[PDB]
């Protein structure tokens, strides 16, 4: 059972294999998996229910396998369309910004997002 | 009229147009006669003069002059003296509303504002009274129910409440009757339904015997027997 | 920089991708003023 | 006069009726969006609670409360304010963070001592993660949330779609995560500072849910209240209408009498 | 029964109604219908009161209903204007106060020397749109002692008789009551003048105390109404008031109130009408009768 | 045109305006100006009506515009009061109802015996603060059938003519409406009706249905604006209304409606003067013409 929920949408909140990018690297959850808490990093997420796979671009969040086999994924913005150039333009601007200013951390997040997007 | 009633024995019905114009005319004659006009510019003899007109209208042993009057109340102020004098004479009121006509109901008579003073139980018969009271209650509840039922949603209706809605909307359509005179005017042959059969019709509709038949199969129908036929044709 | 502030910034960045909706834009644009208060006086309103 | 002062006042009442009508309808429209949000938010919340429950959730303090900048949302503002006052008797000197003006003012009256942080510029919008995130971030930095061994959040739970019961719930501190037997029901290594991360994340996620519940209660209350207003205004239309009618008749009579008096001479 | 300014047809129905209830034989009807000439209408109450005074001056007790003095007012207005006496206040002639007052004070409870005659005046005033601040009604209110204002809203909302209790007073009424109906009377007028307040603020925090009062108030209100043209015995009124005052009836759900009254009365008559016969003649409820009634009422309450 | 109580200077402007539009060649202006004596003012509409009768009697048609009978009333008042004839309500003569009725009944559409002629009439009444309750307005309103009620707010809001369509009725109405214009304007009545109801919603979060109505209503309001002293042809009334009815104009930006209108007219005049001439001469809108008309509107909407 997968519970994948966002503030403004609710997705999978059964599912067979879920592939997650986590503080602990990358984690895949299949059936019984020991109950965990993981911070989800800004991510490309794949959720597979049977052979069907849906691919989500995710702003990071939290993942918590519950001991009752409920994979609580909470994230702010997760689909395929979310990945679907402008971000590269933005990163250039944001990089210039790092020179003066928290904004540095923002731009760092942007490098991660651009790379993560580029990965798709 | 009195020649018809007294001297031809016939029961007759005499229409009068605006009784506002009766008052207005009387008011002028007073002023012309130079009499001091009384309250709210109305003849001092207002009550008595109307009294003569509306006491010559009466049921004699030979006949009866029934009178339909048209009251075009000024300013819509029922508190005005001219309406008051009229209301004293009136026995029943038929309140044809245009809202009702706008609900496609011809007759245009607003059932909730149509009231009679000889709607008394003894007078109209106990059975008729009970049936009438139920139809009034049904419609009254229906109107109130529709106020928040429409806004909140029709699904909010209880089983009992939508039973009332079902009966009521069927009664509302069943009210629609084409008129013989207006056979041409609507294009639909009229229906005249006798009083005994009116009681019978509403009794059945209240018990929802035929309620399981479309509302537009009750639209513009005649008596209860008639709408059995219309139901069949509508379905066909 | 709180962890969820970090995540928040990422979420805003993520709609920059080409395909967009008003509710998203509203989720990426809001203003307020956090105002301090004393044990009384209110240090000057500073935009959130 | 009599006549004109009646008429202008009646016109005022009419216009008021029109406005209360308008608001009530618009409120229904706005309410629909609010309710939708509240569902999604509550679902998200349930996932966080899934951890806390299964973990065993066993616990100066913090009090956070939410009521919009704007009023005329019925007694949402003051029923919650009253419920703060009772539990601020309970607390010794807890610091109240008031998210939005209406509750801020009422609480300020009750104690000006306890009010340390307050927000403003929230209510007009429907709550969004952006707002919550920033509010949370400032809550951590400004109020140093960890100092408080227990946090409590106040909001208005929209009990039924015609009712609102002011409600509170306790936000679980990082200490809670630490001393809960959540190692026995979940697994983390130690490299992650899961208390310091999960605390922060659920600080906002819990607050956002509370904001959503509240926003829905506010708009719902506003609809209910403005509807009751329309009814009260209607009654006043009828009451002044009778006055108008009487006044109109009286004017005719009084003027007429003057004419008669002149004519008589 | 003085019928002034009433439809000659309607009056003929009234006469027939009275003869249907075979009541004509103890009553006189004076009639000055709408058709009848305005000076006759003007003189119509005064003449009727002369007839009444003959009974009063037999020392015998009588009653006179002047329905409607408002129609006398319109008549006197007409007459005055047709005499071209300058228009009075509100266009009602200025001697209108004298007209009503001279009429009204001829109804009286005399002294023992005069053999204590009665002639009870109940005059019927037709308030235009229920305007209780209008020259003709107020002048009458000032003349009479006590008024029984009736309210349209309640009438419409099926309380017949619609006795508005905000605007009904009796300024010499409590002396009238037989001791039984003083004892059972428990100032329900006060209680339901708390019910009016309770339902005033029903439309804030509705405390259980207010709710309890509301529950009683509502239940009492249901009890009061009585179908028109069916009057009830004085004896029968004693238990009904007892029930409500002693809160025995308060507890019966609103739906079964109608049942409760008829059934209660039937129950009492079947159970022992002896108690009611005693209170009818004695005209007082002894401590024993009060207890016996408490017991009997408790007996009905159970069933 | 019957100029009643109007300053000689104002009527000079009227005469001058008539001369500008060279309309004297079918006009008659009966003038009783302010200066003219109160008997002349009294008889001025009456005199005028007689002038109309010759045309009517000859079986022709004509239009007599009594402007304004409100000032006629004042003159009759002046006469009656000065002749000490009994005064009446609002110090207006008792037979003022009779005066107005006498004038207003001498206009009609006659039988085919009488050569089918008529005298159309259009009385003008000046409302003192919009008080239709006022005695002279109430009387006239009763006598007349149909009213057009201009409203000050609309005038200020630049809707010229300022006709308040809520307060305009025409009992005879559509009986004399041209068939073409009748066909394409049932919708227009209904749309405007919705626009009135949906008016108050003008102040945020609004249903799409409500917004569609709002868009239609605003564009329609602009369409019903007209430049004063520049009447438009019926053959150009019909196309414009068809467009609005078909919601073609809805898309057009609010500001651009005025320009769009004139352009549309010129576009029709150049492109489709076959259509215009057909509309005019047939006096009816054939389905085939309406087909073409939709096309023309579409083309114009595109550019």
Swiss-Prot record, chain A:
Leader peptide range in chain numbering: none
Location, primary (coarse class): mitochondrion
GO biological process: proton motive force-driven ATP synthesis
Superkingdom in the source lineage: Eukaryota
Keyword Transport: yes
A Gene Ontology molecular function term of the record: proton-transporting ATP synthase activity, rotational mechanism
Keyword Transport: yes
Cellular component GO terms, alphabetical: mitochondrial inner membrane; mitochondrion; proton-transporting ATP synthase complex
Keywords: ATP synthesis, CF(1), Hydrogen ion transport, Ion transport, Membrane, Mitochondrion, Mitochondrion inner membrane, Transit peptide, Transport
Compartment annotation: Mitochondrion; Mitochondrion inner membrane
Subunit and partners: F-type ATPases have 2 components, CF(1) - the catalytic core - and CF(0) - the membrane proton channel. CF(1) has five subunits: alpha(3), beta(3), gamma(1), delta(1), epsilon(1). CF(0) has three main subunits: a, b and c.
Family of this protein: Belongs to the ATPase epsilon chain family.
Record protein name field: ATP synthase subunit delta, mitochondrial
Species for this entry: Saccharomyces cerevisiae (strain ATCC 204508 / S288c)
Gene: ATP16
Residues of the full protein shown: 33 to 158 of 160
Curated annotation (Swiss-Prot), chain B:
Keywords: ATP synthesis, ATP-binding, CF(1), Hydrogen ion transport, Ion transport, Membrane, Mitochondrion, Mitochondrion inner membrane, Nucleotide-binding, Phosphoprotein, Transit peptide, Translocase, Transport
Name of this chain's protein: ATP synthase subunit beta, mitochondrial
Coverage span on the entire protein: 273 to 508 of 511
Disulfide bond residue pairs: none
Subcellular location per the Swiss-Prot or TrEMBL entry: Mitochondrion; Mitochondrion inner membrane
Highest taxon in the source lineage: Eukaryota
Similarity field: Belongs to the ATPase alpha/beta chains family.
Note: Present with 164000 molecules/cell in log phase SD medium.
GO biological process, one term: proton motive force-driven ATP synthesis
Any one cellular-component term (Gene Ontology): cytosol
Function: Mitochondrial membrane ATP synthase (F(1)F(0) ATP synthase or Complex V) produces ATP from ADP in the presence of a proton gradient across the membrane which is generated by electron transport complexes of the respiratory chain. F-type ATPases consist of two structural domains, F(1) - containing the extramembraneous catalytic core, and F(0) - containing the membrane proton channel, linked together by a central stalk and a peripheral stalk. During catalysis, ATP synthesis in the catalytic domain of F(1) is coupled via a rotary mechanism of the central stalk subunits to proton translocation.
Native source organism of the sequence: Saccharomyces cerevisiae (strain ATCC 204508 / S288c)
Residue positions, PTM Phosphoserine: 101
Keyword Zinc-finger: no
Keyword Nucleotide-binding in record: yes
Main localization (coarse): mitochondrion
UniProtKB/Swiss-Prot annotation, chain C:
GO BP terms: proton motive force-driven ATP synthesis; proton motive force-driven mitochondrial ATP synthesis
Keywords tagged on the record: ATP synthesis, CF(1), Hydrogen ion transport, Ion transport, Membrane, Mitochondrion, Mitochondrion inner membrane, Phosphoprotein, Transport
InterPro entries assigned to the protein according to its UniProt record, in alphabetical order: ATP_synth_F1_esu_mt (IPR006721), ATP_synth_F1_esu_sf_mt (IPR036742)
Compartments reported by the entry: Mitochondrion; Mitochondrion inner membrane
GO cellular component: mitochondrial inner membrane; mitochondrion; proton-transporting ATP synthase complex
One Pfam family cited in the UniProt record for this chain: ATP-synt_Eps
GO molecular function, one term: proton-transporting ATP synthase activity, rotational mechanism
Coiled-coil ranges per UniProt: none
Similarity annotation: Belongs to the eukaryotic ATPase epsilon family.
General function of this protein: Mitochondrial membrane ATP synthase (F(1)F(0) ATP synthase or Complex V) produces ATP from ADP in the presence of a proton gradient across the membrane which is generated by electron transport complexes of the respiratory chain. F-type ATPases consist of two structural domains, F(1) - containing the extramembraneous catalytic core, and F(0) - containing the membrane proton channel, linked together by a central stalk and a peripheral stalk. During catalysis, ATP synthesis in the catalytic domain of F(1) is coupled via a rotary mechanism of the central stalk subunits to proton translocation.
Additional facts recorded: Present with 4280 molecules/cell in log phase SD medium.
Gene responsible for this protein: ATP15
UniProtKB/Swiss-Prot annotation, chains E, F:
Keywords tagged on the record: ATP synthesis, ATP-binding, CF(1), Hydrogen ion transport, Ion transport, Membrane, Mitochondrion, Mitochondrion inner membrane, Nucleotide-binding, Phosphoprotein, Transit peptide, Transport
Note in the entry: Present with 41500 molecules/cell in log phase SD medium.
Molecular-function GO term, any one: ATP binding
Organism per entry: Saccharomyces cerevisiae (strain ATCC 204508 / S288c)
Site (Required for activity): 168
Main location: mitochondrion
Description of how the protein assembles with itself and partners: F-type ATPases have 2 components, CF(1) - the catalytic core - and CF(0) - the membrane proton channel. CF(1) has five subunits: alpha(3), beta(3), gamma(1), delta(1), epsilon(1). CF(0) has three main subunits: a, b and c.
Record-stated family: Belongs to the ATPase alpha/beta chains family.
One GO BP annotation of this record: proton motive force-driven ATP synthesis
Subcellular location: Mitochondrion inner membrane
Residue window of the full protein shown: 240 to 544 of 545
Protein name stated in the entry: ATP synthase subunit alpha, mitochondrial
Gene Ontology terms: cellular component: cytosol; mitochondrial inner membrane; mitochondrial intermembrane space; mitochondrial nucleoid; mitochondrion; proton-transporting ATP synthase complex
């Amino acid at each position: 059972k997968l519970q994948f929920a966002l503030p403004h949408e609710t997705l999978y909140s059964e599912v067979t294999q879920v592939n997650l990018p986590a503080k602990s690297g990358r984690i895949g959850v299949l059936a019984n998996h020991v109950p965990t808490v993981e911070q989800l990093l800004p991510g490309v997420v794949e959720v597979m229910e049977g052979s069907n796979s849906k691919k989500f671009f995710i702003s990071g969040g939290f993942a918590t396998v519950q001991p009752d086999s409920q994979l609580c994924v909470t994230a702010i913005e997760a689909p395929l369309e979310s990945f679907s150039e402008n971000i590269k333009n933005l990163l250039a601007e944001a990089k210039k910004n790092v020179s003066s200013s928290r904004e540095a951390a923002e731009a760092a997040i942007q490098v991660e997002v651009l790379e993560n997007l580029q990965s798709v | 009229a009195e020649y018809f009633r007294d001297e031809e024995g016939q029961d007759v019905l005499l229409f009068i147009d605006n009784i506002f114009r009766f008052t207005q005319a009387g008011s002028e004659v007073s002023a012309l006669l130079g009499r001091i006009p009384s309250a709210v510019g109305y003849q001092p003899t207002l009550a008595t003069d109307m009294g003569l007109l509306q006491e010559r209208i009466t049921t004699t042993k030979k006949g009866s002059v029934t009178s339909v009057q048209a009251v075009y109340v000024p300013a819509d102020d029922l508190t005005d003296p001219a309406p008051a004098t009229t209301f004293a004479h009136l026995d029943a009121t038929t309140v044809l509303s245009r809202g009702i006509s706008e609900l496609g109901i011809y007759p245009a008579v607003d059932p909730l504002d149509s009231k009679s003073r000889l709607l008394d139980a003894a007078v109209v018969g106990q059975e008729h009274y009970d049936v009438a009271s139920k139809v009034q209650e049904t419609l009254q509840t229906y109107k109130s129910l529709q106020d928040i039922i429409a806004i909140l949603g029709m699904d909010e209706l209880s089983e009992q409440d939508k039973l009332t809605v079902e009966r009521a909307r069927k009664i509302q359509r069943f009210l629609s009757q084409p008129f013989a005179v207006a056979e041409v005017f609507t294009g639909i042959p009229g229906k005249l339904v006798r009083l005994k059969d009116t009681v019978a019709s509403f009794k059945a509709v209240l018990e929802g015997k035929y309620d399981n038949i479309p509302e537009h199969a009750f639209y513009m129908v005649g008596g209860i027997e008639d709408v059995v036929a219309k139901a069949e044709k509508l379905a066909a | 920089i709180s962890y969820a502030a970090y995540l928040n910034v990422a979420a805003q960045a993520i709609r920059s991708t080409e395909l967009q909706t008003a509710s998203v834009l509203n989720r990426s644009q809001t203003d307020a003023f956090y105002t301090q208060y004393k044990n009384a006086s209110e240090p000057t309103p500073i935009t959130k | 006069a009599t006549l004109k002062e009646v008429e202008m006042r009646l016109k005022s009442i009419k216009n008021i009726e029109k406005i209360t009508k308008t608001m009530k309808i618009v409120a229904s429209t706005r309410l629909s969006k609010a309710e939708k949000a509240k569902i999604s938010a509550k679902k998200m919340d349930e996932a966080e609670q899934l951890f806390y429950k299964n973990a065993e959730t066993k616990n100066k303090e913090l009090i956070v409360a939410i009521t919009s900048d704007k009023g005329l949302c019925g007694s949402i503002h003051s029923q919650l304010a009253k419920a703060v006052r009772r539990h601020l008797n309970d607390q010794p000197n807890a610091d109240i963070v008031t998210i939005g003006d209406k509750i801020k003012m009422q609480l300020l009256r009750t104690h000006p001592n306890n009010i340390k942080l307050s927000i403003n510029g929230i209510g007009k919008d429907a709550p969004t993660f952006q707002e919550s995130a920033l509010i949370a971030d400032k809550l951590l930095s400004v109020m140093k949330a960890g100092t408080y061994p227990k946090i409590s959040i106040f909001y208005n739970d929209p009990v039924s779609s015609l009712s609102f019961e002011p409600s509170e719930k306790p936000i679980f501190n990082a200490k809670t995560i630490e001393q809960s037997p959540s190692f026995g029901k979940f697994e983390i290594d130690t490299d992650a500072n899961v208390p310091r991360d999960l605390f922060e994340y659920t600080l906002a996620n819990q607050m956002l849910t509370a904001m959503a519940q509240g926003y829905a209660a506010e708009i719902s209350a506003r609809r209910n209240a403005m509807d009751n207003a329309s009814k009260n205004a209607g009654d006043m239309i009828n009451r002044y209408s009778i006055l108008y009618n009487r006044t109109r008749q009286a004017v005719i009579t009084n003027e007429l009498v003057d004419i008669i008096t002149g004519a008589s001479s | 029964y003085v019928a002034v300014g009433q439809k000659r047809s309607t009056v003929a129905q009234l006469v027939q109604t009275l003869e249907q209830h075979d009541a004509m034989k103890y009553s006189i009807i004076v009639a000055a219908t709408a058709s009848e000439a305005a000076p006759l209408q003007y003189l119509a109450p005064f003449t009727a009161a002369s007839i009444g005074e003959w009974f009063r001056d037999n020392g015998k007790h009588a009653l006179i209903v002047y329905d409607d003095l408002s129609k006398q007012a319109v008549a006197y207005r007409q007459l005055s204007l047709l005499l071209r006496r300058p228009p009075g206040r509100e266009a009602y002639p200025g001697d209108v106060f004298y007209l009503h007052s001279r009429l009204l004070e001829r109804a009286a409870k005399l002294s023992e020397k005069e053999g204590s005659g009665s002639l009870t005046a109940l005059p019927v005033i037709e308030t235009q749109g229920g305007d209780v601040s209008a020259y003709i009604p107020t002048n009458v209110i000032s003349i009479t002692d006590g008024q029984i204002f009736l309210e349209a809203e309640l009438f419409y909302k099926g309380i017949r008789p619609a006795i508005n209790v905000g605007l009904s007073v009796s300024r010499v009424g409590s002396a009238a009551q037989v001791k039984a109906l003083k004892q059972v009377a428990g100032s329900l007028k006060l209680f339901l003048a708390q019910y009016r307040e309770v339902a005033a603020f029903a439309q804030s925090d509705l405390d259980a105390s207010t709710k309890q009062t509301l529950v009683r108030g509502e239940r009492l209100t249901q009890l009061l109404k009585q179908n028109q043209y069916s009057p009830l015995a004085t004896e029968e009124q004693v238990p009904l008031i007892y029930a409500g005052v002693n809160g025995h009836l308060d507890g019966i759900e609103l739906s079964r109130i109608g049942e409760f009254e008829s059934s209660f009365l039937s129950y009492l008559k079947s159970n022992h009408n002896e108690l009611l016969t005693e209170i009818r003649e004695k005209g007082e409820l002894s401590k024993e009768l009060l207890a016996s009634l408490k017991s009997a009422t408790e007996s009905f309450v159970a069933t």
